[PDB]
């Protein structure tokens, strides 16, 4: 997208979202990132929404094909492998944008935490499909990214901040589903929920709605896990 203006790429990403054209939306936002300027809060959200939709469809397809493969010529494995390779390619693309150079140029806590949460998520999606020599290393990469995000978030954000809350939610999912640490997942989700609940009194009506929506998700996991 090198010949398109940054502002036009951002405008088109917004149009692509309204049209439910998430692959286009991701390509527009990748082009925007590659212009080399830092991203605003709204632009970070467009980038994240685009790729979460793309990889979400791939993950759902991969789970369907993997289930069929587990229940049973080479066609099912071949097709599962092609969807898997495509999913890994998208994750690698996102990780490459974060490494060149979104994270290193992100100095305030809001931006850096956002990108490190992304990094943990995309390594987590790689871990979901990993089986071999690098499954352990991929899991550690996800852990390290989430942990650094958590350390900054606890130092620099209030406990009701929605990015801090979503980070803790996803890290708890990492512990439960990837790292075989359900007790760590439960402890993290409970502590996060309780510390947020104690801070709600400081919030406006609108912020209260933002925070409680994510706190509910923590609760729904705790209900499924306990």
């Amino acid at each position: 997208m090198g010949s398109m203006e940054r502002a036009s790429l951002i405008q088109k990403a917004k149009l692509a979202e309204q049209a439910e054209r998430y692959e286009d939306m991701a390509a527009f936002m990748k082009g925007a990132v590659e212009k080399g300027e830092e991203l605003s809060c709204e632009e970070r959200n467009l980038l994240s929404v685009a790729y979460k939709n793309v990889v979400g469809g791939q993950r759902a397809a991969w789970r369907v094909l993997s289930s069929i493969e587990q229940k049973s010529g080479p066609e099912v494995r071949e097709y599962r492998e092609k969807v898997e390779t495509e999913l890994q390619g998208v994750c690698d693309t996102v990780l490459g944008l974060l490494d060149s150079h979104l994270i290193k140029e992100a100095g305030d806590a809001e931006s850096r935490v956002f990108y490190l949460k992304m990094k943990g998520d995309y390594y987590r999606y790689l871990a979901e499909v990993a089986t071999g020599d690098d499954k352990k290393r991929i899991i550690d990469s996800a852990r390290s990214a989430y942990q650094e995000a958590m350390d900054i978030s606890k130092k620099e954000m209030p406990p009701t901040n929605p990015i801090r809350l979503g980070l803790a939610l996803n890290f708890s999912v990492f512990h439960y589903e990837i790292a075989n640490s359900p007790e760590e997942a439960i402890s993290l989700a409970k502590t996060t929920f309780d510390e947020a609940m104690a801070d709600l009194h400081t919030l406006s009506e609108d912020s209260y709605k933002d925070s409680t929506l994510i706190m509910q998700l923590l609760r729904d996991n705790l209900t499924l896990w306990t």
């Binding site: 917004k14 979202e17 709204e42 959200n45 467009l46 994240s48 929404v49 979460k52 939709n53 979400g56 998520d121 979503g166 939610l169 996803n170 999912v173 994510i214 998700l217 729904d220 996991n221």
Partner: peptide
Amino acid sequence: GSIPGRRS
């Protein structure tokens, strides 16, 4: 489940 994260 994780953050849905699929709507801006």
